[PDB]
From a paper:
[name] (ERAV) is closely related to FMDV. The generalized picornavirus capsid is built from 60 copies of each of four structural proteins (VP1 to VP4), which are produced by cleavage of a single polyprotein by viral proteases (for a review, see reference 16). VP1 to VP3 each comprise an eight-stranded beta sandwich and form the three quasi-equivalent conformers required to build a capsid with a pseudo-T=3 surface lattice. Using cryo-electron microscopy (cryo-EM) and single particle image processing, we have determined the structure of native ERAV virions, together with the structure of a massively expanded, empty ERAV particle with large pores through the capsid layer.
The expanded structure has large pores on the particle 3-fold axes and has lost the RNA genome and the capsid protein VP4. The expanded structure thus illustrates both the limits of structural plasticity in such capsids and a plausible route by which genomic RNA might exit. The expanded capsid is much larger than the native state, with a maximum diameter (measured from the center of the particle to the tip of a pentameric turret) some 12% larger (355 Å versus 316 Å). However, the expanded state is clearly built from pentamers of the viral coat proteins, and a reasonable fit of the atomic coordinates could only be achieved as 12 isolated pentameric units. The rotation and translation of the pentameric capsomeres required to form this particle from the native state is enormous, with the points of the pentons moving by as much as ∼60 Å in three dimensions. Unsurprisingly, such large movements completely change the interacting surfaces between all adjacent pentamers, disrupting a large interface with complementary electrostatic interactions in the process. The new interface that holds the expanded particle together is obviously much smaller than in the intact particle. The core of the interaction appears to be predominantly hydrophobic in nature, with the strongest density for interpenton contacts in the expanded EM map corresponding to the location of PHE118 in VP2. The pores in the expanded capsid are the obvious route by which RNA could leave. They are located at the icosahedral 3-fold axes, and are essentially triangular, with an edge of ∼75 Å and an in-circle diameter of ∼45 Å, easily enough to allow even base-paired regions of the RNA (with a diameter of 18 to 24 Å) to leave.
Author numbering:
A (entry chain BA): 31 to 230
B (entry chain AA), C (entry chain AD): 1 to 246
D (entry chain CA), E (entry chain CD): 1 to 226
Amino acid sequence: GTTYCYSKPDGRPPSTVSDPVTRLGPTLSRHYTFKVGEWPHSQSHGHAWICPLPSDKLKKMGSFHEVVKAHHLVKNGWDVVVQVNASFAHSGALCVAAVPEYEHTHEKALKWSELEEPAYTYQQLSVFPHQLLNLRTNSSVHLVMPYIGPGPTTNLTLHNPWTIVILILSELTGPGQTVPVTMSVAPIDAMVNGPLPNPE
Amino acid sequence: VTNVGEDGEPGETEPRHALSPVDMHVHTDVSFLLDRFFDVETLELSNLTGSPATHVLDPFGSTAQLAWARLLNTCTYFFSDLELSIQFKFTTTPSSVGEGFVWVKWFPVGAPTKTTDAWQLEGGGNSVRIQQLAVAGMSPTVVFKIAGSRSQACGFSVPYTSMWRVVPVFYNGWGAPTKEKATYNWLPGAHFGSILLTSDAHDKGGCYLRYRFPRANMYCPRPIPPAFTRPADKTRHKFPTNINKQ
Amino acid sequence: VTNVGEDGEPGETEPRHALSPVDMHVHTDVSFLLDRFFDVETLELSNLTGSPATHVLDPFGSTAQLAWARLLNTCTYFFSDLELSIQFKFTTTPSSVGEGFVWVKWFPVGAPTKTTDAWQLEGGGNSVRIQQLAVAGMSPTVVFKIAGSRSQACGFSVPYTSMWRVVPVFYNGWGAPTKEKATYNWLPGAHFGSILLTSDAHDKGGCYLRYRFPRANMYCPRPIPPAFTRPADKTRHKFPTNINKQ
Amino acid sequence: APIRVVSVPESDSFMSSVPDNSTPLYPKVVVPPRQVPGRFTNFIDVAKQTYSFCSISGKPYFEVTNTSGDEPLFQMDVSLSAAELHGTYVASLSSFFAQYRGSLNFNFIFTGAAATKAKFLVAFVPPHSAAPKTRDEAMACIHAVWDVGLNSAFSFNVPYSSPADFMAVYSAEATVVNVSGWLQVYALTALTSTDIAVNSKGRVLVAVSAGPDFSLRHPVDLPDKQ
Amino acid sequence: APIRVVSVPESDSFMSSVPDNSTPLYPKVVVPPRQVPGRFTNFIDVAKQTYSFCSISGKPYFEVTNTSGDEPLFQMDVSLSAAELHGTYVASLSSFFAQYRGSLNFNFIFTGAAATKAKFLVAFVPPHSAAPKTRDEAMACIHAVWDVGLNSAFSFNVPYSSPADFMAVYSAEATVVNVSGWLQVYALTALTSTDIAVNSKGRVLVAVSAGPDFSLRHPVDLPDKQ
């Protein structure tokens, strides 16, 4: 099922740039596939894989990466599908949310990492656009998020509006092996501004 | 499954008749809750002389065990206007002050801030000097006397002056190209401006700053932190109250 | 040549999409900017007795490092009305004054000015004398007491009284037939009139004159002088501000 | 011409929440258009359209094992001051107000493996001498039978039953407007599994939402922490 | 009959910019008709309809000589606090305000003799690690080729590119709303002349105007000189 975070994406150009805006078509900002990590039996509720978008993986976003890299500002949404590979004998559940302006990260800024959420946060993470990933019912979460930020566009080098939080609510039990967490990310309605110099 | 009541079948639930309205959810309205004076901050007056620093009006990242602190932390982006009430409470003998004018200057988001005493008033030998930026001019200067004052205060409304269309209460990124631990959840200008309280009192007392946020708009709800500790399993917290068994 | 974008041909420039309005240029409006109180001048009170001189209200040729000073020097001819705020700030012990009446007299452009104490008030032996031109009459006299006063001030509006249809802020010629270095950028009556502050306080304190210029009209723009020094080549001036990296 | 006016005794006082504004000193500022998604205007809406997880012994769930029966697996007294409602959005939002009205919606999500099954009996017990200790006792009350393996999730509404139109947010020693009873969950059957060595227990997550008739009134200031 | 009135606490205070007038004491003065040409009502109009010359090393122009190439002839960071914008009308008008929005229009006027010719490449470089040092580097950016001898004057618009709706007039250590990048001018070719002994160098005057979308808000008081 598709969950729209706050609203559907738009292709409107930034109100605050009087310079040419380049609309990256789908064949240019393609789609990228990552393995987020492995969910083990030892990890406990509250543990979360924090995936700011993108910033530590921008370098692995091929085409999109090349274009973004050469320009100063970017406005764009994302289409993400988080999956899990578990058997029908595995028990457990995650909550995967899309958080605007997520922060905690002890300035390991814009790096995909793992942390232990503080209770009132894991209890209430459902207050943000999300989907539960119960191991007895489903294996995927699909979230589509619009561009969001204090201004009409940003510099992805200094700001990551959206960050995906995959959080353990019910620990993994059942067969001894781990459950790999997987994620596909596709930039959506990307618009780019002001070309930067040649890299000499 | 089966849905409604009294057969006790698996998945079946009994009938519930929802209650009628009464209060109309008026009190849980965002802008209603914020349009009132809150005692946020308390601050010291600067002497008329010297090179004072301005105090930035930023009630956003608070930890204060007060209702405005958590409430302002319930959303990701915020927009509202502002009203202030500045009061002045003696911390010494009220008879120390025979006149006690207090100059208040408010500065919009982005205003230049270096001041040094520069405006001289002259009278019968002795003279008085006030700051370059305390003088009445382009931005609002308010002058109130504390001495016989029936309320030793002042108050006025000011608008949202930031350059951002919305103030980020939380920001996953840096407000400056140099990524210093400092500029982290930052973004310049995510506030209401700054004030400068200046007076021959300065010692003798302090202020009391209250903010009122008319026209508040909140965006993207966030988790609300607890306020009290967790009671024991299967119990209830028990607080002193108006009601309580005598 | 070629005009708009991306072929890189000689004379060709790339596309620019102009920004939408937002603020509507309201703040750069001449009369809006001038209709506010400005702390221009500070002045001494004259004793009730003697032959005092009147102070002319002429904020035009200023050098003051203040926003009204440069701004008034941005045009060649000016017209506006006037509002005043006169305050009084002690420079001694506030308990020196037990009554402290202050007589203010405003004079239209062209008014005669010689005064000497001439109006006697009598009471129980002792008597009090006030100036010939401080008495209430043809032109406005304002009387305020400084003692218990919650604001030790007064204020009122007055119109443009000059005989010139417009005040020349700059004048390439002489205001008198005798061409004395004195009457050079001159022209008589290029001002708002004059005031006379008179009081038994006089020592004990001074005033604070603020001008407000409602209905301002400016003619023929002129160059605007810098305000700050020139930074080094290819650099930027860096000023303390609200924003600034913490 | 001067208007005869009489100064009220409460004259120069402060009064923090006056229904009126102060005088403006910095006019004519047109603010930039704030597009931005997700604006909310009333906290009750986000409380109703959103769920939080309870705090059962510090975890967001209770467990069923292959050894269970009788005793209650989950028990919480119906009061916003209850412990298991601790980290929730609804409980936390409530501390800003003095009184509440309406129902709470609880939904249990069984996260035990697909090879696992169990049945629960969830009961709403009204105020009474002392809370039932076994399910045969509670089953006389309003209850529902949840057979997992029919639906993996189950919603139960704790009703509002009281002679008062609103009850207290801040509870204390039991009063007639303090507590509304108890919510309990029992195991109708213990957890069964395809292999007890692989799956011996299953966890039921419990989440709360404000009911459709839920409301909060009387904003209050925060008291000393406790 | 006397009206019940309550005195607000901010009662006898001053507040300099109140949106209201004082009481008039010298009524009925009819003012003479003021014909006089050139009245202006908004400073932004004179800023847009007028140009000033920049201050490049204290002169209103940069030079090209018969020996030039690579290096930038003119470089200024896009901020109203920039040095080369120093003596200008737009920069000076700006000090009265806290924030600005919009573009700046620069026009270069080649004043080298008619027997002289050269070509320039003018680029707008967005915020970056460090500013290009040669033209082959900058030419990747927004740029225009100005061949003198086609038009002796050339207008270039420095755009507004920022996530914020307004930027700061008063700059400081680089922030996200302080600086918008750099404006550079390079010599695509060195000055050629009919006789290098007679004309060895030519000067390009550089003037600035407020762009069509330029605006200024928030009047501010002057701080200590620096």
